[PDB]
Design a protein around this ligand. Structure first.
Ligand SMILES: [Mg+2]
Ligand SMILES: [Mg+2]
Ligand SMILES: [Mg+2]
Ligand SMILES: [Mg+2]
Ligand SMILES: [Mg+2]
Ligand SMILES: [Mg+2]
Ligand SMILES: [Mg+2]
Ligand SMILES: [Mg+2]
Ligand SMILES: [Mg+2]
Ligand SMILES: [Mg+2]
Ligand SMILES: [Mg+2]
Ligand SMILES: [Mg+2]
Ligand SMILES: [Mg+2]
Ligand SMILES: [Mg+2]
Ligand SMILES: [Mg+2]
Ligand SMILES: [Mg+2]
Ligand SMILES: [Mg+2]
Ligand SMILES: [Mg+2]
Ligand SMILES: [Mg+2]
Ligand SMILES: [Mg+2]
Ligand SMILES: [Mg+2]
Ligand SMILES: [Mg+2]
Ligand SMILES: [Mg+2]
Ligand SMILES: [Mg+2]
Ligand SMILES: [Mg+2]
Ligand SMILES: [Mg+2]
Ligand SMILES: [Mg+2]
Ligand SMILES: [Mg+2]
Ligand SMILES: [Mg+2]
Ligand SMILES: [Mg+2]
Ligand SMILES: [Mg+2]
Ligand SMILES: [Mg+2]
Ligand SMILES: [Mg+2]
Ligand SMILES: [Mg+2]
Ligand SMILES: [Mg+2]
Ligand SMILES: [Mg+2]
Ligand SMILES: [Mg+2]
Ligand SMILES: [Mg+2]
Ligand SMILES: [Mg+2]
Ligand SMILES: [Mg+2]
Ligand SMILES: [Mg+2]
Ligand SMILES: [Mg+2]
Ligand SMILES: [Mg+2]
Ligand SMILES: [Mg+2]
Ligand SMILES: [Mg+2]
Ligand SMILES: [Mg+2]
Ligand SMILES: [Mg+2]
Ligand SMILES: [Mg+2]
Ligand SMILES: [Mg+2]
Ligand SMILES: [Mg+2]
Ligand SMILES: [Mg+2]
Ligand SMILES: [Mg+2]
Ligand SMILES: [Mg+2]
Ligand SMILES: [Mg+2]
Ligand SMILES: [Mg+2]
Ligand SMILES: [Mg+2]
Ligand SMILES: [Mg+2]
Ligand SMILES: [Mg+2]
Ligand SMILES: [Mg+2]
Ligand SMILES: [Mg+2]
Ligand SMILES: [Mg+2]
Lengths: 67, 144, 60, 260, 124, 185
RNA sequence: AGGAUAGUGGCCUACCAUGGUUUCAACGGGUAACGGGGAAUAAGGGUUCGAUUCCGGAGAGGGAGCCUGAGAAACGGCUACCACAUCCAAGGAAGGCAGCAGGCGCGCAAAUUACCCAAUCCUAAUUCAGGGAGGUAGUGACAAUAAAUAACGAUACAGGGCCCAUUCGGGUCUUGUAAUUGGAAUGAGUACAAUGUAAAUACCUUAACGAGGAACAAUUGGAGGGCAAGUCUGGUGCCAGCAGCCGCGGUAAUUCCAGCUCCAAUAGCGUAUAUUAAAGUUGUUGCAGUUAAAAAGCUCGUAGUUGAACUUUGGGCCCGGUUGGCC
């Protein structure tokens, strides 16, 4: 079996040059559990239609259901 | 000099008098003027699709005496009424009228086969059933 | 010739032959070993030499 | 086509980058810089395809962006920075000094030079004009302009850039009998001491080259780059020294020295 | 004969559930057919039971009342939200059946149509 | 889209498909060597045709030519290295008279038979496709392995793949299991 | 000469001149014509194809107009019209999938509303953000490469080697028909685990499983000639049909429908269309023109094509290189 290996001078230097997926295979860094890729694309397009923060628009919503 | 010119500055005469003599072939004549495109109802294609209008009882030409059991097929992309042939031993019972068909040729570039007059095309499939497999009884024709 | 013709016997000869069953024969070899069985029947043991050899004779 | 193109597909890259047909779809496009598109080579090509230090194109930014990498004195923190002919690549780590020179075959070589040689470089002047307020300037092949040169320096000469300032420390006059390193064409990488030059008033001047092995060949004026006098090369020549012998004798050295 | 394949091996699913425990937890389901005479109003009931809860509102039947006075049959305020077919609206009666599902708060219902004519008995 | 992966066919076909003098001759090549198809015969004749194109093109050129002497010596040495062309036939006029028989002799299927590891020419094919005898350390299971001249003496049984060492086998295990269980405990 | 433009220019506008192209084929029409690098065929010369992985051009339903900006007459920018078309409480608002999927329609004819930037590389105040570019996987007999569907013994009667052959010859150099059998060697598949990968699937690895024929059973065409392989048996009887071509079918049809046997190719094979070779049946290489298709009734005659001989040929020396001879 012909492979390829890397060995560093220390452990703290190994965390900044190695990719983030090899740290998950080895247990050195925990894998973050984000949303799906097609789910982040739909959240981004819903933030494009909201200009500003969004709490200002929510004040308009509570005055719509009353009247 | 065997009729043709042999001048060193005479390549123009040898390239025009070829083009005045390429109109004597068959293959060069059918390609430029669109004879396969305008006439010969398959529009430069290998197969097509049509609808059976009626069945034929076309008698074979001399010296043979037989009935070739042809059909009348009206095409979809052109709408021309084209006779068609069933190349099996009794798949005329396997076909009906007003059916989606699939047509092909004979291997003679038009030019009706001989002993079957006026028919230049054959039938391969009728509504996607592969009549070769029905003649060997491999599958079943649908009800609709 | 004519156009109007009879349509009553569209496959009658096929519908009157006696449908017989294929005989259960042993399996022929496939691919490479079929070329072994084909090589023996041509040069190992010639069946008959009646001037020239024949690959499918008749019973006589 | 409606704007400047930012991508460069593979198999449109030049041959001297030696990019493979597989392992990707797009080739590294160099940015604007000292050299042209075909005569340059990016820093992403020089590390992972020539030196094999990095592995992926994202890992190349771990070398270039941080520290310890400088090109001709200045840092040049850029992935696709065009580095071409006579560009001194100085690595502060590993005490290594590099010189981008062509092969005998015509490809960018890994040529290692000492600390004393990496201080200077040679640049062919292109033209000489008068700038603002009557100040003369020469334009080298890498876009470097030099204010107040020697008036003896004319077109198609070369200079010796100090790489700490812009002053000229040495100049070589274009004359018959100078070592000329051919840059461009089918004869890329050859040397060989100009015998004479044909005038050709009207453009595209031709220069006859007859080297030490008595091989006569003709190059244009755009390919001529003097590197010193008759003998005594001012820069360290690479392995092979630009001979380009026949392919029937290329296999003689590969079989008797290593195959035997 | 040899057309397709046939086996007698049932394939078990990945999530098996108990059959007798789901029937008690399921909603009550019915399949009732509405027969009757030719002129008995069996389809007017079908246009009114399919009017109450969630099926049709006032934004879709007031448009049907404009088509009721237009085509002459102004007395057919109901019995047209069930059948949307030509030659049924200008004559009055249906020509074929239709299956319209119904959902209420507690049970489940499936109401189907039935023609009343003696010629349309095989359709019934 | 990336670069197009090029590909070329390795076999050919004759102009006359039906010939008594050809089909009897090609079937002798499939009997003495154990080939399964006529395609593997046609694959050799296609490779034999590409060599005559690299030989007849050079015999129309003048001698002392750096194109003839380079490509010609590369054509002779490659055929000597695979063991087809002998040591006393390096004059380059002998590769045109080279036949189909010398190419099939250097295949690995008849090389096992001439060495003495297989009892027949068809027993060797079963030894090839069933993970047996290796060329070196590398195990080859394909009969179209062009055995070079230096790789002829290294042909030997594998460390795996039994009657090669220290392994009884798979179906021999259950044969020895049912014998010891029924007769013993 | 002016205007316009980033700039040259009848680009545009005034005044003036009457030119410009063309049988060496202008102009007009047709193109089922994006151009090229190239592709198929393969003695040579050629013929045919090029929508398409690269380069250049054009376009974003049809045309026209303009803003921002270094770069756009941009349409995943805007405005108007036309052709379509969406929501409406009918007051109005909004839209351009020849982007990635997917739907309808047209069709002889062509895939998933999947995963991810991890490679490839690009954009941004840029290492760490984003990218339906791109990659991965599914579908997939477009093509292409590699080659499973078996191999080896023993015995029973027969024959062909041979030593010795003295009337029963069996022994070992040995080919086969054997509806008695024998242990082996396997992979397709399944499957711990590992590896592969961003995470998986598959490959390459490897425990435990996995051939004795009812298998984990190879088909597709054909058996008159062309063209390789039957004058076998049954049915049909100028009917059904087979037949690219010549031709078969009324009593025993060597080509019909079937069985049996056999042949060709083989995980491939047949058919249809287009094209090339065959075609020296497009002939420049390389045709034919008395009678087979074909020299104008005849002469003059330009464009075109072609065109006699002749103006430094010999002689005498001196230096090497390039191969090959004798060593
Ligand atoms: Mg995201
Ligand atoms: Mg935002
Ligand atoms: Mg005529
Ligand atoms: Mg002709
Ligand atoms: Mg049409
Ligand atoms: Mg249509
Ligand atoms: Mg008709
Ligand atoms: Mg860049
Ligand atoms: Mg950077
Ligand atoms: Mg009713
Ligand atoms: Mg009524
Ligand atoms: Mg094994
Ligand atoms: Mg002007
Ligand atoms: Mg201008
Ligand atoms: Mg003017
Ligand atoms: Mg004038
Ligand atoms: Mg005029
Ligand atoms: Mg004129
Ligand atoms: Mg003309
Ligand atoms: Mg012309
Ligand atoms: Mg074209
Ligand atoms: Mg077009
Ligand atoms: Mg193209
Ligand atoms: Mg098109
Ligand atoms: Mg496409
Ligand atoms: Mg351009
Ligand atoms: Mg219009
Ligand atoms: Mg536009
Ligand atoms: Mg769009
Ligand atoms: Mg766009
Ligand atoms: Mg509308
Ligand atoms: Mg309102
Ligand atoms: Mg309106
Ligand atoms: Mg799409
Ligand atoms: Mg896009
Ligand atoms: Mg679709
Ligand atoms: Mg569709
Ligand atoms: Mg398809
Ligand atoms: Mg990425
Ligand atoms: Mg994608
Ligand atoms: Mg894409
Ligand atoms: Mg698949
Ligand atoms: Mg096994
Ligand atoms: Mg078995
Ligand atoms: Mg099988
Ligand atoms: Mg068959
Ligand atoms: Mg038969
Ligand atoms: Mg024959
Ligand atoms: Mg005839
Ligand atoms: Mg008979
Ligand atoms: Mg025949
Ligand atoms: Mg074939
Ligand atoms: Mg010629
Ligand atoms: Mg000839
Ligand atoms: Mg002729
Ligand atoms: Mg006559
Ligand atoms: Mg005549
Ligand atoms: Mg005459
Ligand atoms: Mg003239
Ligand atoms: Mg003359
Ligand atoms: Mg002389």
């Amino acid at each position: 079996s012909v492979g390829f290996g890397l060995v560093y001078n220390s452990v703290a230097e190994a965390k900044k040059f190695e990719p983030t997926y090899r740290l998950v295979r080895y247990g050195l860094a925990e894998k973050v559990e984000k949303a799906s890729r097609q789910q982040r694309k739909q959240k981004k397009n819903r933030d494009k239609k909201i200009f500003g923060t969004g709490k200002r628009l929510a004040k308009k919503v509570a005055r719509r259901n009353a009247d | 000099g065997k009729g043709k010119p042999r001048g060193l500055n005479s390549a123009r005469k040898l390239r025009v008098h070829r083009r005045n003599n390429r109109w004597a072939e068959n293959n060069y004549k059918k390609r430029l003027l669109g004879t396969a495109f305008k006439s010969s109802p398959f529009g430069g294609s290998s197969h097509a699709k049509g609808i059976v209008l009626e069945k034929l009882g076309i008698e074979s030409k001399q010296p043979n005496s037989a009935i070739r059991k042809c059909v009348r097929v009206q095409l979809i992309k052109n709408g021309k009424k084209v006779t068609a042939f069933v190349p099996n031993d009794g798949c005329l019972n396997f076909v009906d009228e007003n059916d989606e068909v699939l047509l092909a040729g004979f291997g003679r570039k038009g030019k009706a086969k001989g002993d079957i007059p006026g028919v230049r095309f054959k039938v391969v499939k009728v509504s996607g059933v592969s009549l070769l497999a029905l003649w060997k009884e491999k599958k079943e024709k649908p009800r609709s | 010739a004519k156009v109007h013709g009879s349509l009553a016997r569209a496959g009658k000869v096929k519908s009157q032959t006696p449908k017989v069953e294929k005989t259960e024969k042993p399996k022929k070899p496939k691919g490479r070993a079929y070329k072994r069985l084909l090589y023996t029947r041509r040069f190992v043991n010639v069946t008959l030499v009646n001037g020239k050899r024949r690959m499918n004779p008749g019973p006589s | 086509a409606r704007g400047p193109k930012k991508h460069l597909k593979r198999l449109a890259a030049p041959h001297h980058w030696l990019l493979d047909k597989l392992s990707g779809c797009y080739a590294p496009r160099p940015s604007a810089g000292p050299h042209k598109l075909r005569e340059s080579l990016p820093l992403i090509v020089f590390l992972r395809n020539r030196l094999k230090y990095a592995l992926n194109g994202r890992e190349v930014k771990a070398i270039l962006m941080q520290r310890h990498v400088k090109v001709d004195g200045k840092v040049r923190t850029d992935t696709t920075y065009p580095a071409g002919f006579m560009d001194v690549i100085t690595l502060d780590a590993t005490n290594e000094n590099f010189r981008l020179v062509y092969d005998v075959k015509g490809r960018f070589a890994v040529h290692r030079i000492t600390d004393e040689e990496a201080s200077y470089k040679l640049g062919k002047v292109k033209k000489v004009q008068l700038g603002k307020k009557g100040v003369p300037y020469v334009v080298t092949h890498d876009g470097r302009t030099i204010r107040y040169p020697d008036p003896n320096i004319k077109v198609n000469d070369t200079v010796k850039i100090d790489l700490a300032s812009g002053k000229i420390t040495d100049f070589i006059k274009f004359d018959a009998g100078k070592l000329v390193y051919v840059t461009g064409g089918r004869n890329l990488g050859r040397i060989g001491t100009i015998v004479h030059k044909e005038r050709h008033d009207g453009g595209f001047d031709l220069v006859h080259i007859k080297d030490s092995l008595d091989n006569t060949f003709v190059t244009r004026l755009n390919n001529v780059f003097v590197i010193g006098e008759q003998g005594k090369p001012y820069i360290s020549l690479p392995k092979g020294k630009g001979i380009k012998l026949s392919i029937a004798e290329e296999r003689d050295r590969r079989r008797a020295q290593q195959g035997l | 004969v040899q057309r397709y394949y046939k086996t007698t091996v049932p394939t078990k699913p990945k999530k098996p559930h108990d059959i007798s425990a789901f029937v008690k937890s399921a909603l009550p389901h019915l399949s009732f057919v509405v027969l009757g005479h030719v002129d008995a109003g069996k389809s007017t009931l079908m246009g009114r039971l399919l009017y109450d809860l969630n099926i049709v509102n006032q934004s879709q039947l007031r448009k049907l009342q404009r088509e009721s006075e237009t085509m002459g049959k102004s007395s057919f305020k109901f019995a047209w939200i069930m059948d949307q077919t030509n030659e049924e609206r200008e004559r009055g009666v249906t020509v074929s059946i239709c299956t319209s599902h119904f959902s209420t708060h507690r049970a489940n219902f499936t109401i189907v149509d039935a023609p009343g004519h003696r010629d349309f008995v095989p359709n019934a | 889209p990336r670069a197009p992966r090029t590909y070329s066919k390795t076999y050919s076909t004759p102009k006359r498909p039906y010939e008594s003098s050809r089909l009897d001759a090609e079937l002798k090549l499939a009997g003495e060597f154990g080939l399964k198809n006529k395609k593997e015969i046609y694959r050799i004749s296609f490779q034999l045709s590409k060599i005559r194109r690299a030989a007849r093109d050079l015999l129309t050129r003048d001698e002392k030519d750096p194109k003839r002497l380079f490509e010609g010596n590369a054509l002779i040495r490659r055929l000597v290295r695979v063991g087809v062309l002998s040591e006393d036939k390096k004059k380059l006029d002998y590769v045109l008279a080279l036949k189909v028989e010398d190419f099939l002799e250097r295949r690995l299927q008849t090389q096992v038979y001439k060495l003495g590891l297989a009892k027949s020419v068809h027993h060797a094919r079963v030894l090839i496709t069933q993970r047996h005898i290796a060329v070196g350390k590398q195990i080859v299971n394909i009969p179209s392995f062009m055995v070079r001249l230096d790789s002829e003496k290294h042909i030997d049984f594998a460390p795996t793949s039994p009657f090669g060492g220290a392994r009884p086998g798979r179906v021999a295990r259950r044969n020895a299991a049912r014998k010891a269980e029924a007769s013993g405990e």
